[PDB]
Amino acid sequence: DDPDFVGADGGGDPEDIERIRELGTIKRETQQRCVTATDYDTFVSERFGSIIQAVQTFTDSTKPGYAFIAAKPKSGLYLTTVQREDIKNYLKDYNLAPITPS
Amino acid sequence: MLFTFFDPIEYAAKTVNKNAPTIPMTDIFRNYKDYFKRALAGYRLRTYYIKGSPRPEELANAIYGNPQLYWVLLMCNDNYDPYYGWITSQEAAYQASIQKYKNVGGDQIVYHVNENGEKFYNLISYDDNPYVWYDKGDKARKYPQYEGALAAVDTYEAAVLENEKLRQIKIIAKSDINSFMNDLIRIMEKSYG
């Protein structure tokens, strides 16, 4: 353990019939896919923002099919590679078919 | 009844440590003693006596019918402490005396008082003539500072006379107590600004 504890977790109404409305009002908006730019990094930095301090997604119109994200591993001035293969891997799950994020 | 009158003040604990939070509190730091002089000076104080060993404010009711004004009595009494400044029963006083002397010693004969009432401190008779008194630290045999029959004072009894003095108080008439009240109040407005 860490020195933060309670005997158990879990519970819930579950519903809270009003509170769920939002949740329903929300998830209808959600995507499992990643598209645009800032959709990615969010979902991206959901993973190891502990490493990439902030991930900055961008493209270039001159070259389609591709996506760029900016990463400080914050352990180093340059993002180390082993991440770059680890991430893009895990990333690769959601890639808009015409597009290869990079 | 007073301190609630003025606005409560915020207070910083700075100078205990360079950073401590600031706290609001009801104000003790208006003097009130000068506040109750100026207004007080208008009328008069009337000496007064106490029937027993009551509490100041418990006693403050019977005179004025209002328990809330104890302080009026208090400032006319202007004692140092409300706890030991007041009349006190024999039981406590002795115990109080018991307390204060206990480490030194119990039942300590405090002083010799002559017939005339003159307290004689630090005195003992060499016992050959109990009427001649050589004081003490002397080993006697020398310099009896007095001769005759004197009383000695028991620390219990000693406690009594102390609290005894507290009996009479100077007070202001229950008639004027009201008329007085407004004036001081008005002064506090001048004292607010």
Binding site: F48, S50, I51, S75, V82, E85, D86 | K102, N103, V104
Partner: protein, 49 residues
Amino acid sequence: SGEIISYYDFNYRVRDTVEIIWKPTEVFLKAFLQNQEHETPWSPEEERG
């Protein structure tokens, strides 16, 4: 000999290689006993005097 001294959580997950120095100059541990005494209570007292 057994058991464990301590655990390096590694902060994230890597593959195939690892390199680590102790930023406290290769010594990870400096253990500190300084200045405490346990016993001291507080109690009433007679002031004498």
